[PDB]
Amino acid sequence: SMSYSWTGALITPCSPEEEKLPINPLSNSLLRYHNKVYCTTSKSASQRAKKVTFDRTQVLDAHYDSVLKDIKLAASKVSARLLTLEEACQLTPPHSARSKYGFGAKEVRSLSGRAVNHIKSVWKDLLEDPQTPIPTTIMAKNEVFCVDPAKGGKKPARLIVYPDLGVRVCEKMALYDITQKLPQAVMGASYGFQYSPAQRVEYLLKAWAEKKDPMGFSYDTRCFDSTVTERDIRTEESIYQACSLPEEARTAIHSLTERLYVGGPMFNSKGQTCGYRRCRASGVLTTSMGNTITCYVKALAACKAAGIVAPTMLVCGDDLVVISESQGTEEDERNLRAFTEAMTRYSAPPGDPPRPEYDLELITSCSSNVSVALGPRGRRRYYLTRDPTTPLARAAWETVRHSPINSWLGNIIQYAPTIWVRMVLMTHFFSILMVQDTLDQNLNFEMYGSVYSVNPLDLPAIIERLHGLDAFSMHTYSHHELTRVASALRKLGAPPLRVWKSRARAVRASLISRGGKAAVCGRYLFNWAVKTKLKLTPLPEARLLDLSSWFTVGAGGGDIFHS
């Protein structure tokens, strides 16, 4: 079957879109080469539509069946419940796309009569009708990147397919509790979303250490969502139904599967019939959970089919890392080819063929890699980092165009120990917050497919909780990091690190002069910037932080909110 069929109708935008980074003295102080920064628009939607449209064949085998049997057995130990309407409403992000039925996220979150009565009607209809396909909207995402002329032109916009807001709330009532219990039961420690950045590093270090002679690879499936077949999606349902659930939950889950998850008609923003989907919807609740389970099953089966020796996996949606015992250079290459052939049979063909690596730091997963620096007392300290180009480009965009989602804050939190966060992002944004005089304002950001709300003044505590006090004392960064970061800054026309250091001294001093939590930020976040460093003591606030909802599977399109 084809992943999509199309009518010829265009994928259209809601509002006018901005393609180019606007000139502005605040964003210019971060980076000058504004012509290199672009935002994807609906102008490139047809190009993407072509890429994600292809035939899927799927041939399963004994290895696949064996893994699937184990998974269903594991799921049978899980008990899940429905969420109340009110619980599901509270999980809706404040800027989630409004319903076509006369209400938005604000109404849902405040439980307005129209929103509530509508959602009740949608729920009842889910229970009564397991058959009629539920309409979805297809939209081009607006995401910011830096040009890469060594890799062709600009990336085409990603596409997102999602149902109406009323349906999205119903998905949470039916399936949210499952998203919070099932992945850990069936994938155990291989499930990546349960780990903070520091824990992810610890997991990978352990996995690597376990092997007498470790070899690792990442596997890139070509357009994973499009490779997911109707059978795959019905199999996911079978796994959900293996849980102990109330009958009403079983009914809603089945209707959602047949009417929404397995496929259905897509409409553009103008309401014209755009096409029909026969693969994974990118913007439904189960997108992340479904991708993770389906990727785990196919990958583990492919390991068995290939004869990979003692595999330890880390799976986050379509993102897959496999660490195992090396069988020798040529044997490893051969076995990776056999793994790829198996994944291909299972309908998960590769983008770039996997490459064996024999050093953990050389494996890229979820766009990140492990690096090492020194903490206080000169101990080696491993931490997660990434190339800063995209985070810098988005930070410049977000400096001049305010967005409901602050990617820069998510980056500061996730990549706090990195030299680029500490010297550049932290310095720039605390500067900008004082310029705006909005330091003490909660901001939203996306992390692991979920939306969170954080006050920047709480960052020392948050950073301490997630990364430890060492995140404020790290030094002697790797040659690779210094080189990669300096090169990104030059490429974007940003000031060099030495300039950021002088800037941070003044930001630090300004924050300290404001006293209170602002002074705590100055002292902790910018201790690296002064010659006479302060002694940083554990923050009592770090322990009081309720991070119980951090680091879990999220939702397609990040359409879930925790506060």
Side-chain angles (χ1 to χ4, degrees):
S1 51
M2 301 296 296
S3 50
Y4 301 91
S5 300
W6 305 95
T7 56
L10 301 193
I11 295 168
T12 52
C14 294
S15 54
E17 303 164 288
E18 202 168 352
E19 308 180 21
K20 304 164 187 292
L21 181 66
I23 295 92
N24 183 273
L26 297 173
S27 54
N28 208 71
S29 66
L30 177 56
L31 67 90
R32 292 177 59 245
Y33 297 167
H34 56 83
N35 285 325
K36 297 195 185 169
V37 181
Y38 69 94
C39 185
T40 68
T41 70
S42 63
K43 194 176 172 187
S44 63
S46 292
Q47 186 183 348
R48 177 67 70 184
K50 192 182 182 182
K51 282 179 147 67
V52 308
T53 300
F54 51 83
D55 187 24
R56 293 82 48 82
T57 56
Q58 188 167 56
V59 185
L60 307 175
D61 53 23
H63 307 294
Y64 181 90
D65 294 348
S66 175
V67 173
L68 187 59
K69 285 179 63 69
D70 286 341
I71 287 204
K72 293 187 181 176
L73 198 67
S76 79
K77 261 49 187 175
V78 174
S79 287
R81 64 166 179 97
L82 288 165
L83 256 62
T84 69
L85 185 146
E86 291 201 26
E87 282 175 317
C89 291
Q90 294 321 296
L91 287 174
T92 303
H95 295 94
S96 184
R98 70 177 293 102
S99 175
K100 71 184 175 181
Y101 292 104
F103 64 91
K106 182 182 185 298
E107 288 71 36
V108 169
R109 290 187 56 78
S110 67
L111 310 170
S112 85
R114 195 188 178 96
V116 167
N117 289 325
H118 179 86
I119 294 168
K120 280 180 187 167
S121 70
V122 172
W123 183 258
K124 294 198 238 295
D125 178 80
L126 283 183
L127 299 185
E128 177 179 285
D129 180 8
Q131 187 79 42
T132 310
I134 285 159
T136 59
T137 305
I138 178 165
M139 294 287 299
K141 289 190 64 55
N142 297 130
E143 303 178 295
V144 169
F145 302 100
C146 174
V147 300
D148 189 349
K151 201 184 176 183
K154 309 160 181 292
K155 299 182 193 175
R158 288 195 308 183
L159 301 179
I160 190 162
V161 180
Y162 58 92
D164 187 78
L165 172 57
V167 173
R168 301 204 301 275
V169 171
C170 287
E171 294 180 69
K172 296 173 170 76
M173 287 186 282
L175 279 152
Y176 176 73
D177 203 44
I178 290 172
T179 71
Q180 300 304 293
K181 293 176 181 178
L182 181 65
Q184 271 166 321
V186 300
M187 294 179 49
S190 302
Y191 164 58
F193 293 113
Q194 70 191 303
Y195 302 121
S196 66
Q199 295 169 324
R200 181 179 176 93
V201 172
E202 183 189 24
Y203 177 75
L204 293 168
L205 285 167
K206 286 183 183 172
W208 198 258
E210 288 181 11
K211 319 305 180 184
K212 173 214 60 180
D213 190 11
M215 176 273 295
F217 64 90
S218 55
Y219 186 81
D220 178 50
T221 304
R222 185 263 297 250
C223 307
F224 189 98
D225 289 350
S226 286
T227 73
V228 176
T229 68
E230 295 156 297
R231 189 172 298 281
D232 285 339
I233 292 159
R234 293 180 170 118
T235 287
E236 292 166 3
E237 194 203 339
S238 182
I239 295 158
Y240 308 152
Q241 300 283 4
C243 302
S244 172
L245 304 170
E247 180 192 344
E248 180 176 11
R250 303 193 177 280
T251 301
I253 289 164
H254 182 65
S255 301
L256 285 167
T257 297
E258 290 306 320
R259 302 176 65 186
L260 175 61
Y261 304 151
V262 302
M266 305 183 298
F267 295 81
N268 64 19
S269 67
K270 294 300 182 287
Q272 305 166 324
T273 302
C274 199
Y276 200 97
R277 161 184 57 91
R278 294 178 200 89
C279 64
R280 167 88 67 219
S282 40
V284 295
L285 174 62
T286 53
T287 299
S288 182
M289 173 178 56
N291 283 352
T292 306
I293 292 172
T294 293
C295 187
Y296 175 89
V297 179
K298 294 176 179 193
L300 192 57
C303 284
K304 297 180 180 307
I308 301 299
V309 177
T312 297
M313 314 196 302
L314 182 59
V315 185
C316 313
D318 68 325
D319 195 277
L320 169 64
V321 175
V322 176
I323 298 169
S324 65
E325 292 282 5
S326 175
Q327 301 299 307
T329 315
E330 299 164 17
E331 290 82 5
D332 285 345
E333 294 270 21
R334 173 200 68 193
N335 293 349
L336 256 64
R337 286 191 299 270
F339 174 87
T340 296
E341 282 163 27
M343 288 294 274
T344 295
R345 291 189 287 278
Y346 298 158
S347 181
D352 308 285
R355 288 291 150 227
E357 302 286 355
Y358 305 90
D359 290 288
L360 172 60
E361 295 90 340
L362 299 178
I363 297 175
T364 290
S365 61
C366 297
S367 301
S368 306
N369 64 280
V370 171
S371 189
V372 66
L374 303 189
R377 255 55 197 83
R379 296 178 166 94
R380 286 169 72 79
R381 180 84 177 84
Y382 295 86
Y383 67 96
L384 200 73
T385 186
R386 61 161 290 152
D387 185 286
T389 300
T390 306
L392 288 176
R394 292 182 181 176
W397 193 279
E398 291 164 12
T399 295
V400 54
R401 295 282 183 257
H402 287 347
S403 171
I405 296 298
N406 296 270
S407 79
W408 60 265
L409 182 53
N411 280 318
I412 290 179
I413 291 174
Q414 284 178 95
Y415 296 105
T418 68
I419 190 165
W420 52 274
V421 164
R422 295 175 77 202
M423 300 189 73
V424 183
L425 290 186
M426 285 185 174
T427 306
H428 181 66
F429 281 102
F430 277 93
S431 170
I432 288 299
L433 292 175
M434 285 181 292
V435 164
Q436 291 176 357
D437 191 20
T438 59
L439 275 169
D440 192 16
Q441 299 210 355
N442 271 50
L443 292 170
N444 296 335
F445 63 101
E446 193 178 340
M447 191 172 64
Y448 292 31
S450 291
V451 180
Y452 298 90
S453 172
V454 156
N455 187 326
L457 294 180
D458 290 337
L459 280 172
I462 293 163
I463 289 160
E464 183 182 339
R465 180 77 171 273
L466 300 193
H467 305 278
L469 280 179
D470 287 341
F472 306 129
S473 302
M474 206 95 49
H475 65 87
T476 312
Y477 287 89
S478 75
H479 185 104
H480 185 238
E481 281 301 285
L482 296 171
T483 296
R484 179 155 69 175
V485 172
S487 308
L489 296 173
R490 287 193 307 271
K491 173 175 63 186
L492 294 166
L497 292 178
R498 66 179 181 271
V499 169
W500 287 102
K501 178 174 184 179
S502 308
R503 195 170 300 183
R505 284 192 187 204
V507 172
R508 177 186 178 272
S510 300
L511 286 168
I512 292 178
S513 71
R514 296 173 179 234
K517 296 167 73 164
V520 176
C521 287
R523 296 189 188 105
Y524 281 71
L525 303 181
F526 296 101
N527 207 30
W528 62 267
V530 286
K531 321 194 196 68
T532 303
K533 308 185 181 310
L534 300 178
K535 296 308 177 63
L536 303 181
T537 57
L539 299 164
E541 321 100 71
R543 318 173 53 85
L544 297 185
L545 260 33
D546 186 348
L547 270 26
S548 63
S549 195
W550 289 34
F551 313 123
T552 180
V553 75
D559 194 45
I560 195 137
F561 179 75
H562 294 111
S563 76

